[PDB]
Amino acid sequence: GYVGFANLPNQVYRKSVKRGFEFTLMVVGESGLGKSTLINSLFLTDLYSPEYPGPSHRIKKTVQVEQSKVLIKEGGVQLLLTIVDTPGFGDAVDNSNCWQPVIDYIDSKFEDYLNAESRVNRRQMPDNRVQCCLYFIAPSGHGLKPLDIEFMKRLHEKVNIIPLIAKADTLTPEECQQFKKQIMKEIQEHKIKIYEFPEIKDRLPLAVVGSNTIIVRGRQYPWGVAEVENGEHCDFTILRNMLIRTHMQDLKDVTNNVHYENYRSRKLAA
Amino acid sequence: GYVGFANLPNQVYRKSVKRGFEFTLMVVGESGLGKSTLINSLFLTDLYSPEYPGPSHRIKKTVQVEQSKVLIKEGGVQLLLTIVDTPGFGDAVDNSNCWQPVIDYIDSKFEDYLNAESRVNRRQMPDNRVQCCLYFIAPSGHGLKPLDIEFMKRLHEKVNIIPLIAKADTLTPEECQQFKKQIMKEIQEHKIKIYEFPKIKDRLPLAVVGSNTIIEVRGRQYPWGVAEVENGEHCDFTILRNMLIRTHMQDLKDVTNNVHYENYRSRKLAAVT
Amino acid sequence: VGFDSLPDQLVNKSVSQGFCFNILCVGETGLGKSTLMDTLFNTKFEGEPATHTQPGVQLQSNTYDLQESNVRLKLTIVSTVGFGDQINKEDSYKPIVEFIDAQFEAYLQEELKIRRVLHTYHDSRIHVCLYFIAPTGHSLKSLDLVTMKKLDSKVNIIPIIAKADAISKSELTKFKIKITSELVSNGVQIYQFPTDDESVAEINGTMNAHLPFAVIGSTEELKIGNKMMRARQYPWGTVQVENEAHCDFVKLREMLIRVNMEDLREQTHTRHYELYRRCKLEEMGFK
Amino acid sequence: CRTVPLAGHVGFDSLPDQLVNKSVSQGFCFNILCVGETGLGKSTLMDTLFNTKFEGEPATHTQPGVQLQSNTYDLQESNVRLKLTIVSTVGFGDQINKEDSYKPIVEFIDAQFEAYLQEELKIRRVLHTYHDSRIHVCLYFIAPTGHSLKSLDLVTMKKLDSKVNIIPIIAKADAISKSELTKFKIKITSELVSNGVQIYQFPTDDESVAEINGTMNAHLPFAVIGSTEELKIGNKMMRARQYPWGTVQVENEAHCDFVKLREMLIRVNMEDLREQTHTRHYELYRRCKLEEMGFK
Amino acid sequence: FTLMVVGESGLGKSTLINSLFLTDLYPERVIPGAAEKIERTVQIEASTVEIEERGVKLRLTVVDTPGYGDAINCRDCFKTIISYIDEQFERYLCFYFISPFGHGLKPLDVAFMKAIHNKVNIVPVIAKADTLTLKERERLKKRILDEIEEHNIKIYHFKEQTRLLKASIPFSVVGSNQLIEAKGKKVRGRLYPWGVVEVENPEHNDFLKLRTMLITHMQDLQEVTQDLHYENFR
Amino acid sequence: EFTLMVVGESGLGKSTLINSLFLTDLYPERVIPGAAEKIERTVQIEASTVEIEERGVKLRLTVVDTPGYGDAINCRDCFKTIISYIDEQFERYLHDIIDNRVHCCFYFISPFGHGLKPLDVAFMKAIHNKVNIVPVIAKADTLTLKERERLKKRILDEIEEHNIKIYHLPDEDFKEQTRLLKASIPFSVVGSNQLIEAKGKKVRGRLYPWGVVEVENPEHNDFLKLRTMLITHMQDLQEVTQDLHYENFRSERL
Ligand SMILES: Nc1nc2c(ncn2[C@@H]2O[C@H](COP(=O)(O)OP(=O)(O)OP(=O)(O)O)[C@@H](O)[C@H]2O)c(=O)[nH]1
Ligand SMILES: Nc1nc2c(ncn2[C@@H]2O[C@H](COP(=O)(O)OP(=O)(O)OP(=O)(O)O)[C@@H](O)[C@H]2O)c(=O)[nH]1
Ligand SMILES: Nc1nc2c(ncn2[C@@H]2O[C@H](COP(=O)(O)OP(=O)(O)O)[C@@H](O)[C@H]2O)c(=O)[nH]1
Ligand SMILES: Nc1nc2c(ncn2[C@@H]2O[C@H](COP(=O)(O)OP(=O)(O)O)[C@@H](O)[C@H]2O)c(=O)[nH]1
Ligand SMILES: Nc1nc2c(ncn2[C@@H]2O[C@H](COP(=O)(O)OP(=O)(O)O)[C@@H](O)[C@H]2O)c(=O)[nH]1
Ligand SMILES: Nc1nc2c(ncn2[C@@H]2O[C@H](COP(=O)(O)OP(=O)(O)O)[C@@H](O)[C@H]2O)c(=O)[nH]1
Ligand SMILES: [Mg+2]
């Protein structure tokens, strides 16, 4: 007694698989916070090999946004991924307004995609808009450096910002909890709207530890091993789930229906 | 020992003990690198306390160097100790020539000391010139931050600087020694000469860990292990204590008032009219 | 990475929005449009029989809202009334081409708006067009060939022979040939099923060999024991709607059992919403 | 002394172990000045004070005027090297007209000051590889007349106190009696006090050696004997002196307070003597001179 | 002696006539091309059939009308038929087929019937009767009776057969050129996927009733055409 | 009848010796001055008469000593009073029964130095042609025997080079006594009138923590030699003064 409405999701899935997939992930952070190692570990553990050095050599004379188009064949699904990362940021002699190239790249990608998909003769084209930016934070232990506060309060209406506690494996749970409370009190002295997962803030923000060496991929210290697989504060699974497994389509949806649309009603405003 | 002029060591010992002692040590580094904790752990956790907090608040709007005076009377010998701390250094958005107030402070101390020991009615007024400088380089790994590179190519001819790899509990030994060797390369490539502490495993710079929790009793208990400061195989805090406190204060003062104060006065008094 | 769950991440969010579909049934009064469609959705709808005294073709455009295990479809059924029942044929397709044009128009003029919303919009475009053909038995009639002459470039038209219980099979096949040649006489490319996605293309390929279908519909359920299935009753026999030798109601119910519904949306948005824009939208700009 | 204390012993009471070792490695330098008549025993006093003959053909009584036999030696007992400088007057009191006696001595001392001072105002300072020659001690000999101080002795004592640290010693104590030595000592100390002559007072600040200095302060001036006539009194010692009625010995406290004199060198006050020259004599000369020096 | 076979070119007139009179009136006839029947003209041909019954007439010719329908727009669409009947009625000096694919009397019925019902008595006939259910049959019959009554349309009007004929005026018919077998009755059947429809069953349709009415009232048609319509002719 | 002079630096112990010669005290109230005002003190004549007839018959001799001789830092021609005194005495006696007419002059020499301090040479070059000079080493209890003989030889040599006219003694036990007496010059003396215990008993002598120096022992010093020479040659000194010095003064300006 059914006509076949249930088959619509099956058609949607089978159609989307054939068309291929793309992604563009921004990683922003001062050097030495494990960005390259984390990004290499996340995706199949193959990128930034000594054949292609990348920002591991922190060239600080100039900042030059360097993406990397890579192709991954997950069994039968094609993912064309880019990791937009800025070599050299917030570490040189001066760092005032040291974020203009980043917002430059983001707005340029928005504008170029809008050009691609707004002409009369438009067709199917690649997509190069960034979907989410992971902003690393060093574990100072007292609050947030004013550069991070300016980065939040400035570039937050344009791209999904996810604050990470870079190298969380150098903190104590009591001071880590007080650090979390302090940062989410300065988040309400300076009102900031981070990307909130749909529906609790106590076990936020995400803190991550990354590595490449196998030992369980974990780092070795004289007093043993620092691991990545846990749930207390070295949470290398909550990010890999609430970024890839669960909400990544929601990331695209919120970039489009909010961010990309905010720009589209900004450049078309007058 | 019958004529007995060999009793000079006893005489100078007694006069020195009766006279008293003083010292002045300054610490600089990016705020949040674990400096106040290390200072407390050095002179047994009584200088900085919730009754008087140091650079933990880190008011970085104007970097005004602060100094604290403590009296310690451990073994019948009482010295007055001056901890010199820099609130706001390097943390703010701009780090352009941020070292200038430190130079102002040290050189003003030199000038006031010279005015002390140049008047006709000179006296035994206390000396304040800073004797030792501890720099906390962040343990970023595979490279030295340009800010500190330009820091230690300017002041190294004014005060004895001993570079310290702060929070060195976060570096695997292989990367630790590789980073140290690269620091030597960028030192003996940019023509940098630093205090030589008159080896193989204890190759300068030195690594320090500063803890205040009473567990394991200065130590830290991470959910994966323990970090202890006394053991020498994990870190090298005791090496810094040996060749900073117990052994080389007198040599530090000698080099300060023989090679640095001497150069400051051979600059000034050779430029005076 | 081990996370291939990207294709599932958007399936689970569309069902929250709900689905929307449309259907255009074109055919002169009397062929059994409302009856066939009520049987197709196995539901009783609001379409009462019309009158032969309708001076002008009108569009019912009756909307509904059905349900299934998870999906909440918002149907929008549009059917011609009083079509092809007077002495006028070259001016018959106008009120059934202006409809698709005006259904393009609203979505278009909302696509170019400044503070536009697209996450939740009710697309009113016509997504498919069944075409009932009278079961005459010699070749396609005048109005039929003229209508498929100048309609195939707007919707995924599908030719089906209605009331197909008055044509012998031993003749029917010849009719098929004698119509398909006319299809390639004017050379009209009626909806070709994809036959490109190698996962499922051969079903589409064989569907295209029997592309002129045959259908029948009635809201009376007669034979029992097996089940309460719907059929046809005459003093000399009974007709089974899904016997696969009487009528191809199942073969037409392959756009409804959804071998290709999303393909219809894609071809509407990329081959009929383009020729209306790649060429016809050149009024302003880029010339 | 309510202060902020520590907990564990930081490794702290080791400053007067770094300062001590720094000075040993660079040796010491000392300067003694023997002031007294020719023939009183100055050269023999130093020979029996440092247990080694140094030099010295006795000054002729035909010396036209007092000069200064200055000599620097490199004695070393153990682990300690002294640049010693004995500065003995020659011809002091030889001639008759002794009114112009002390000047060739006193100028000498002042001259030595300039050396040290000449390296201070000089900007190419090297004060760590430097060997000054300032007179550090002045041993002043008094002839055992028995009545009072001789006139030249009084005038030199009064007009040389405020330059270097003086110790007055009674030379050739083989002449006066202890029944009369007490009255002699009382009279000479009384006229020292009445004439405002402020002899070196042993320090009474520190409490480790407070009362030893306190008691030695009331024994001034000392009576001393010095010789090298190698006489063995039954056991190993030579520093004695023959006489037809009985030998005299030097290292006994009954006859002469020789050890009370050596208690300015052997243990207690000689580093303090160096410091005192550096802090109340040198500074006084700086006060009196940096008013013609045109420097403030 | 006047009759018509008028339909929408596909109701089944050819096979109906061929089985009614046992003829092959068009040995060489081709359906007009689909791309060629845009301006489908209407043309009339001749006929030559000898009828064998209880009574034998001289000859019988039917007014075959190829291309009457299938018009993009009937400009004239009515000319040659009335011309031929007028000429046939001047030398001295009627079946109308309703399609079953509709709610009842489609347009072109009121016009044609109103035009010719005063010229020749008309016999309504529902072609392709094998697609109408009995309930729908009665519904459409009542509807067409009301429609012909509403706009003043007169068509036509032992005795048990007379009452049966006068109670079902719109005869339901089928046509079957080739004889096919069914349940032991094999006389001019049509094959369907569910078996065979038999033309002569009195319950499926009223073909034999139409044949009896035509073959017995030929004198009636001749006299009404020679006395009633002839007076109105002049 | 007789008169004797003693001269020497103040403090050598000459009052005590001249007391020990005559077993008497003859300066009742004398206050030894303080160092503060003897800076430039002068020299006076202290002549005291005392009666002794130990060897002769009646010799109420007077002893003359000069207090404050050479004591001042600079001798402001300290030879004036003594030479004036001797000349005055010769002119007074030769006015002629003898009033004083000083016959012998002891000169005390300090033993601390290395020999004749140039003032001693000055005095013995100024006076040696007027009176009988006798050199006597005062405080002879501070000289070791070897230094004693070296000092004796250097005194003799500084006599020879400056040609000092020391009074040689005029030439069977008498011969040996004169030989030893003329060999032992200059003599050594120790004076002490504090009667202090010794080996025998109750003798004159000084006391030190190391010894008890006596006086009449001719081995400790030559005190008894000096006394016996003076006593025996009283007459010879008178004769030499009469026949070589007074005659010379009469031959010279009168
Ligand atoms: N033989 C046959 N009759 C049918 C079929 N479908 C419907 N009918 C009959 O034809 C009549 C008309 O059909 P409707 O349901 O009114 O649909 P329609 O013919 O398109 O007419 P409208 O929808 O009012 O324009 C119905 O009442 C049915 O009795 C069919 O498939 N075969
Ligand atoms: N009374 C006394 N005589 C001494 C003493 N020491 C040495 N003498 C003797 O006195 C003489 C003086 O010797 P020196 O000390 O060399 O003479 P001096 O003091 O150096 O005199 P100058 O050469 O001018 O410096 C020596 O020959 C010794 O025999 C002493 O302590 N007391
Ligand atoms: N800070 C840090 N350094 C690492 C880590 N793993 C390896 N390294 C060292 O850092 C060098 C490469 O640095 P890089 O990965 O570019 O540092 P990043 O930019 O912070 O990711 C290698 O030579 C390693 O020795 C890590 O987890 N953290
Ligand atoms: N891992 C590690 N953390 C440290 C160390 N020393 C201090 N900390 C952390 O630093 C925090 C205190 O920082 P603080 O010294 O006040 O920073 P400052 O005021 O800028 O000098 C504490 O919460 C400690 O957890 C160390 O040696 N290792
Ligand atoms: N349903 C039905 N179909 C028929 C009948 N007679 C013929 N046909 C079919 O109708 C088709 C065309 O008939 P046709 O000769 O063109 O009829 P005409 O147009 O009226 O002359 C033939 O292929 C036959 O199979 C009938 O009585 N009923
Ligand atoms: N060693 C020694 N000391 C003497 C002798 N005679 C006197 N004295 C000391 O000399 C002091 C008195 O000397 P004095 O006769 O007044 O000599 P004057 O001041 O020159 O007249 C006494 O205190 C004695 O200690 C002597 O023969 N030997
Ligand atoms: Mg000498």
CB D126 within 8 A of CB D119: yes
DSSP reduced 3-state for A175: helix
- H or E element: which one contains F203? strand F203-208
Q: How far is CA C11 from the centre of its chain?
A: 25
What residues contact residue F33 under an 8 Å CB cut-off, 6+ apart?
D147, D148, F41
Q: Taking the domains of chain F in order of start, what are their residue ranges? A: 1-254
C-to-N gaps above 2.5 Å in chain E, after residues: 93, 157
Reference B224, options A239, A202, A173; nearest CA is A173
Give D65-69's long-range contacts (Cβ < 8 A, gap of 24+).
D65/D91, D65/D95, D65/D104, D66/D90, D66/D91, D66/D92, D66/D93, D66/D94, D66/D101, D66/D104, D66/D105, D67/D91, D67/D104, D68/D104, D68/D105, D68/D108
CB D63 within 8 A of CB D92: no
Q: How far is CA C224 from the centre of its chain?
A: 31
Query: Which of E70, E103, E108 is nearest residue C30 as measured by Cβ atoms?
Result: E103
**Count of beta carbons in the 10 Å neighbourhood of residue F62:** 16
User: Which amino acid is present at F62?
Assistant: T
Distance CA E48, CA E23 (A): 9
Distance CA F69, CA D259 (A): 36
Residue with token string 């078996």: E195
What residues contact residue D107 under an 8 Å CB cut-off, 6+ apart?
none
- Ligand 3: distance of its center to the CA of B176 in Å? 11
Q: Which of C91, C139, C246 to mutate to test the interface with E (most CBs of E within 10 A)?
A: C139
User: Which amino acid is present at B6?
Assistant: A
Give the single-character DSSP code of F103.
Answer: -
Give the single-character DSSP code of B255.
Answer: H
Ligand 5 lined by E128 (C-beta under 6 Å): yes
Ligand 2 nearest atom to the CA of residue D42, by list position = 19
C-to-N gaps above 2.5 Å in chain F, after residues: 96, 171
Distance CA F19, CA F27 (A): 9
Distance CA D256, CA D236 (A): 19
CB C128 within 8 A of CB C181: no
CB C85 within 8 A of CB C29: yes
CB F8 within 8 A of CB F116: no
CB B162 within 8 A of CB B244: yes
What residues contact residue D87 under an 8 Å CB cut-off, 6+ apart?
D31, D32, D33, D34, D68, D69, D70, D71, D108, D135
Distance CA F22, CA E30 (A): 202
Tell whether the torsion through CA atoms of C283, C284, C286 and C287 is positive or negative: positive
Reference E150, options E104, E182, E101, E199; nearest CA is E104
Reference A58, options A25, A33, A26, A39; nearest CA is A33
Closest residue of chain C to E104, computed from CA coordinates: C52
Q: Taking the domains of chain B in order of start, what are their residue ranges? A: 7-271
Residues 177-196 of D with CB under 8 A from B: none
Query: Which of D194, D245, D247 is nearest residue F36 as measured by Cβ atoms?
Result: D194
User: Which amino acid is present at F185?
Assistant: I
- Ligand 7: distance of its center to the CA of D36 in Å? 10
Query: Exposed/middle/buried for C63, CB within 10 Å: 0-12, 13-18, 19+?
Result: middle
Residue C142's region, left for phi above 0, alpha for psi from -120 to 50, else beta, is alpha
Whole-angstrom CA distances from D28 to D4, D15, D17, D23, D75 are 38, 20, 17, 7, 11
| Token representation of residue A264 | 């589209």
Radius of gyration of chain B, Cα coordinates, nearest whole angstrom: 20
Ligand 2 lined by F142 (C-beta under 6 Å): yes
Ligand 1, residues at Cβ distance < 6 Å? C 29-35, 47, 49-50, 81, 163, 216-218; E 131, 136
Whether cis (ω within 30° of 0) applies to the bond prior to B198 is no
Q: How far is CA E75 from the centre of its chain?
A: 23
Complete DSSP assignment for chain C: -----HHHHHHHHHHHH-EE--EEEE--TTS-HHHHHHHHTTS--S-----TT-SS-EE--EE-----SS--EE-EEEEEES-S-SS--TTSSGGGTHHHHHHHHHHHHHHT-TT---SS--------EEEEE---SSS--HHHHHHHHTTTTTS-EEEEESSTTSS-HHHHHHHHHHHHHHHTTTT----------TTS-HHHHHHHHT-SEE----S-B---SS---BEEEETTEEEETTSSSS--HHHHTTTTTTSSSHHHHHHHHHHTTTIIIIITTTTSS--
Residues in a beta bridge with A26: A84, A133
CB F141 within 8 A of CB D242: no
- Ligand 6: distance of its center to the CA of F201 in Å? 23
Distance CA B17, CA B75 (A): 10
Residue with token string 């720094």: D22
Distance CA E176, CA A100 (A): 87
User: Which amino acid is present at E120?
Assistant: V
A225 to chain B, any CB pair closer than 8 A? The answer is: yes
| Token representation of residue B233 | 């195989």
Residues in a beta bridge with F206: F213
F71 to chain D, any CB pair closer than 8 A? The answer is: yes
Q: Which-ligand-closest: CA of B219?
A: 4
What residues contact residue A145 under an 8 Å CB cut-off, 6+ apart?
A137, A138, B91
Reference C176, options C133, C130, C235; nearest CA is C133
What residues contact residue E188 under an 8 Å CB cut-off, 6+ apart?
E19, E176, E177, E178, E179, E180, E198, E199, E200
Reference F111, options F49, F37, F187, F202; nearest CA is F187
Q: Obtained via which technique?
A: cryo-EM
What are phi and psi for residue D191, nearest 5 degrees?
A: -75, -25
Residue with token string 């030792």: B132
For the B7-271 domain, the top CATH level (class) is alpha beta
CB C30 within 8 A of CB E101: yes
Whole-angstrom CA distances from D111 to A61, A182, D166 are 64, 72, 18
CB C195 within 8 A of CB C206: no
Task: Tell me how many degrees the CA angle F22-F25-F27 measures, rounded to the nearest 5.
Answer: 125
| Token representation of residue A62 | 């100039």
For β-strands E171-172 and E123-126, DSSP reports them as parallel
For the E5-233 domain, the top CATH level (class) is alpha beta
CB C107 within 8 A of CB C125: yes
Query: Which of B32, B139, B141 is nearest residue A141 as measured by Cβ atoms?
Result: B32
Distance CA C269, CA A122 (A): 12
What are phi and psi for residue B165, nearest 5 degrees?
A: -80, 90
Distance CA D23, CA D4 (A): 32
Whole-angstrom CA distances from D150 to B90, D42, D145, D182, F137 are 77, 18, 8, 18, 20
Distance CA A111, CA A123 (A): 16
For β-strands A77-85 and A21-28, DSSP reports them as parallel
What are phi and psi for residue A130, nearest 5 degrees?
A: -70, 145
Query: Exposed/middle/buried for D215, CB within 10 Å: 0-12, 13-18, 19+?
Result: exposed
Complete DSSP assignment for A197-232: PP--GGG-S-EE----------EEETTEEE-S--SS
CB D137 within 8 A of CB D273: yes
Distance CA C179, CA B46 (A): 102
Q: Which residues of D32-44 are buried (b: 16+ CB within 10 A; e: fewer)?
A: bbbbbbbbbbbbb
Ligand 4 lined by B210 (C-beta under 6 Å): yes
Give the single-character DSSP code of F216.
Answer: S
Query: Which of B60, B213, B224 is nearest residue A225 as measured by Cβ atoms?
Result: B224
**Count of beta carbons in the 10 Å neighbourhood of residue A162:** 19
Give E74-83's long-range contacts (Cβ < 8 A, gap of 24+).
E74/C87, E74/E108, E76/E42, E77/C87, E77/E42, E78/E112, E78/E115, E79/E42, E80/E42, E80/E43, E80/E44, E81/E4, E81/E6, E81/E42, E81/E44, E82/E115, E82/E116, E82/E119
Resolution, angstroms, 1 dp: 3.6
As separate numbers, helices (DSSP H) first and strands (DSSP E) second, chain B gives 8, 8
Reference B160, options B248, B87, B236, B86; nearest CA is B248
Q: Which-ligand-closest: CA of E130?
A: 5
| Token representation of residue D33 | 């000045």
User: Which amino acid is present at B146?
Assistant: P
Distance CA D148, CA F35 (A): 6
CB A63 within 8 A of CB A122: no
Give the single-character DSSP code of D234.
Answer: S
- List, in sequence order, the alpha helices (H) in chain E: 13-21, 79-88, 109-116, 134-150, 160-167, 207-216, 218-233
Give the single-character DSSP code of D200.
Answer: P
Report the C-alpha dihedral over residues C154, C158, C164, C168, rounded to 10 degrees.
120
Query: Exposed/middle/buried for A220, CB within 10 Å: 0-12, 13-18, 19+?
Result: middle
CB contact under 8 A, A74 and C1: yes
Question: Across the beta sheet with F187-188, what order do the strands follow?
Answer: F46-49, F62-65, F3-7, F104-109, F132-137, F187-188
Distance CA D50, CA D262 (A): 10
Distance CA F242, CA F250 (A): 10
Distance CA C201, CA C210 (A): 15
What residues contact residue C155 under an 8 Å CB cut-off, 6+ apart?
C24, C100, C126, C127, C128, C129, C268, C272
3-state secondary structure B97-159: CCCHHHHHHHHHHHHHHHHHCCCCCCCCCCCCCCCEEEEEECCCCCCCCHHHHHHCCCHHHCC
End-to-end CA distance of chain B: 53
CB E129 within 8 A of CB E173: yes
Contacts of B46 in chain D (CB under 8 A): 4-7
Chain C contact partners (≥3 CB pairs within 8 A): A, E
What are phi and psi for residue B232, nearest 5 degrees?
A: -95, -15
The answer to whether the annotation marks E225 as part of a ligand binding site is no
- Ligand 4: distance of its center to the CA of B68 in Å? 19
Reference D32, options D47, D10, D16, D12; nearest CA is D47
Distance CA E156, CA E169 (A): 8
Query: Exposed/middle/buried for C180, CB within 10 Å: 0-12, 13-18, 19+?
Result: middle
Contacts of F149 in chain D (CB under 8 A): none
Closest residue of chain E to C143, computed from CA coordinates: E72
User: Which amino acid is present at A31?
Assistant: S
Reference C33, options C52, C49, C17; nearest CA is C49
Ligand 3 lined by A208 (C-beta under 6 Å): no
Residue with token string 């009283």: F234
Distance CA A163, CA A156 (A): 11
Residues in a beta bridge with F63: F4, F48
CB A14 within 8 A of CB C199: yes
Question: Across the beta sheet with A70-74, what order do the strands follow?
Answer: A70-74, A77-85, A21-28, A132-137, A160-166, A207-208
Give the single-character DSSP code of D201.
Answer: P
Distance CA D47, CA D55 (A): 9
Task: For chain A, give the number of residues.
Answer: 270
Reference D133, options D83, D175, D168, D67; nearest CA is D83
Distance CA A103, CA A86 (A): 11
Radius of gyration of chain E, Cα coordinates, nearest whole angstrom: 18
Whether cis (ω within 30° of 0) applies to the bond prior to B205 is yes
Contacts of D145 in chain F (CB under 8 A): 10-11
What residues contact residue C84 under an 8 Å CB cut-off, 6+ apart?
C27, C28, C29, C92, C143
Reference A74, options A245, A209, A228, A211; nearest CA is A245
User: Which amino acid is present at B38?
Assistant: L
Distance CA B85, CA B102 (A): 10
For β-strands E95-98 and E5-6, DSSP reports them as parallel
Ligand 3 lined by A177 (C-beta under 6 Å): no
Reference E216, options E142, E165, E173; nearest CA is E165
Give F46-51's long-range contacts (Cβ < 8 A, gap of 24+).
F47/F100, F50/F22, F50/F24, F50/F26
**Count of beta carbons in the 10 Å neighbourhood of residue B158:** 19
Task: Tell me how many degrees the CA angle C54-C60-C64 measures, rounded to the nearest 5.
Answer: 155
Reference F14, options D145, E115, B242; nearest CA is D145
Reference D270, options D169, D160, D136, D167; nearest CA is D136
User: Which amino acid is present at D62?
Assistant: T
Q: Which of A11, A43, A117, A254 to mutate to test the interface with C (most CBs of C within 10 A)?
A: A11
Radius of gyration of chain A, Cα coordinates, nearest whole angstrom: 20
